[PDB]
Nucleic acid binder design. Structure first.
Lengths: 117, 110, 39, 56
RNA sequence: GGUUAAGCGACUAAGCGUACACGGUGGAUGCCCUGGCAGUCAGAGGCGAUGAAGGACGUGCUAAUCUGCGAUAAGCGUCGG
RNA sequence: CCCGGCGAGGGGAGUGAAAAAGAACCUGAAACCGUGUACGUACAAGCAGUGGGAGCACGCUUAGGCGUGUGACUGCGUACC
RNA sequence: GUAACGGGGCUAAACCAUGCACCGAAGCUGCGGCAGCGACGCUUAUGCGUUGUUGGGUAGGGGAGCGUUCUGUAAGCCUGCGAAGGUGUGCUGUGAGGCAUGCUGGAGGUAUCAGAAGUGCGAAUGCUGACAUAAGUAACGAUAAAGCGGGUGAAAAGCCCGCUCGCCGGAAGACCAAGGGUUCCUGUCCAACGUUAAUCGGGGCAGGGUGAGUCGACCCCUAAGGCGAGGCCGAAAGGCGU
């Protein structure tokens, strides 16, 4: 009833190494280091899935603020004026409009400026 | 077409031999035969013997016109290592490796 | 025939010498210089 | 003194970047026999600067 | 078209990194078995002063290591297969 | 049969289903060491990754772009028991 | 080494009072999916539908599973239309995993439901084998010393001839007993051994060589000491002694 551990262990080791392609130095050749590298990479990926949703909002805010001051209004006043006029455009869409259609952005801006009155 | 000659189990370390092999990578046969003769290293004799033997093969087995052959590929790799014992002070003892090498030269008319 | 036989059998032997070479009494006597943080 | 961490196979290659040796290119032809030799050295059959020499 | 300025700027690898292709060293893994392990069922439960257990040296056409044998020395007589 | 020291080691020819089964000879992994090809790298500071992301090269493609490799620049980030 | 705002910098970008905007977390809301524990209805079991609420976790308790070798189901099923093994690619499960297929490989392998375990490794200054780093670095074993010509040879600083030079000479000279066991001489070979090369050798291989009435053992005689018929002692084994 003796059991030898060759094939199983070999396959289990090969599974981890194939996940570490592109890693510098011994971090892609020896199991004892590749294991730790992969575990770290998993942790960083899980953490970064939350951060990705913050960087893009940061970028959108910056771009909207830039485009709004071209038409003589600040970002905060612009956003406040949009809600007093009951306009619900997502910040991502607002940034896209600012990049790709200046006339539409001005059309929004003048309306917000009137809503503040 | 390609022609090969090999020296297996050459009594010299791989690192030392590779220094010689770098000189003649990609030259014409006559220039290589010239360079190896006027270089003062032990390895240069071995590489020259191998290269000459390769030249002979490409003429007698394959076609001819040794006047336009070139050295296309050449490389060195390690072989089995013999182990021996050398004593030291205070009764301690140490391991000794006597490394060897394998020699291959690729000569072709391209 | 003094090619593959003599070489590898000689290579075999050296192992026992390295193994029996360690049987030497490596006592150093002691550490001869004064203790590091003695009394 | 010994190393604390073994150096990588990259640092080993970087150090060896000056170990390459050089060829000669200074091959000269004798006036009379026409064979090859180094500068300022006698050819294999004893011929220096055209005039025959010892040639033992 | 030229001559001046001011601004910007592909192309190098002594060597090195990653990926892929082809090799060398080393001997795991798979597959084997006149080698072992644990037992049921029977047998025999001693050999030796007629010289034992264990050995030394010898013994062939050729000289030795194994296997046999003892100056009648890889064997001698008789009765059966 | 050829190169070589009447060497060692090779390249042919030939046997064999197979010689990349050639006597260190079933199969033949990993650490370790090489040759070739594609991209990056000589004003740049730190557990070497992850999240964004130009450019280059190859394959497919009817546009439109996909797939593989690499990765300039930037946010965050002090191994395991 | 500035260094008692994190910096740059600031007479407001400092400190009180008032106000309105906006930024800001894995918190709350939105959309999609999984798993529990109750309630409510149908099937009134399973199978379902409509709801409410819950899911950070060490020591530790409870519940579910994956995979490996062996036995039955087996003279069954898959196997040159290519088995186990090795090596890439592509799909799909929440996970341990599974499936198909290219190349090597050249003879065995196991659905499904049950049974038994030498049943899963990164660490124990763990054990055995192989391979690295420092590194082509330190060293090559007495500071008595070598120079030239010829010869053989594929190749000569180290081998053989010749000349010169230097060292030891109560020893670095010539013998014997111990100890060793063919190392002695001749001819051949240079792949391992010789701390480099080697045509050389106490290295490999093949032949040859050790002659005693007087030298030494054996032999004759005993010292210290050993053994010891009878004998005297002692649980046995044994101790001491003529």
């Amino acid at each position: 009833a003796r059991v030898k551990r060759g094939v199983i262990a070999r396959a289990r080791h090969k599974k981890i190494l194939k996940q570490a392609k592109g890693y510098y130095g011994a971090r892609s050749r020896v199991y004892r280091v590749a294991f730790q590298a992969v575990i770290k990479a998993g942790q960083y990926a899980y953490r970064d899935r939350r951060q990705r949703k913050r960087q893009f909002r940061q970028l959108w805010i910056a771009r909207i603020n830039a485009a709004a001051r071209q038409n003589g209004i600040s970002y905060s006043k612009f956003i406040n004026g949009l809600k007093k006029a009951s306009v619900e455009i997502d910040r991502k869409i607002l940034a896209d409009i600012a990049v790709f259609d200046k006339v539409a952005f001005t059309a929004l801006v003048e309306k917000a400026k009137a809503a503040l009155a | 077409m390609e022609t090969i000659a090999k020296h297996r189990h050459a009594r010299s370390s791989a690192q030392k031999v590779r220094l010689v092999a770098d000189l003649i990578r990609g030259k014409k046969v006559s220039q290589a035969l010239d360079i190896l003769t006027y270089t003062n290293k032990k390895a240069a004799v071995l590489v020259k013997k191998v290269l000459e033997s390769a030249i002979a093969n490409a003429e007698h087995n394959d076609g001819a016109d040794i006047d336009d052959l070139k050295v296309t590929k050449i490389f060195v790799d390690e072989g089995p290592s013999m182990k021996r014992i050398m004593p030291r002070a205070k009764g301690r003892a140490d391991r000794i490796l006597k490394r060897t090498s394998h020699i291959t030269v690729v000569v072709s008319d391209r | 025939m003094t090619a593959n036989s003599r070489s590898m059998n000689l290579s075999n032997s050296v192992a026992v010498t390295v193994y029996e070479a360690w049987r030497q009494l490596g006592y150093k006597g002691s550490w001869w210089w004064p203790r590091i943080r003695g009394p | 003194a010994v190393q604390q961490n073994k150096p990588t196979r990259s640092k080993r290659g970087m150090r060896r970047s000056h170990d390459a040796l050089t060829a000669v290119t200074s091959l000269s032809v004798d006036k009379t026999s026409g064979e090859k030799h180094l500068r300022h050295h006698i050819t294999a059959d004893g011929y220096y600067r055209g005039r025959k020499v010892i040639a033992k």
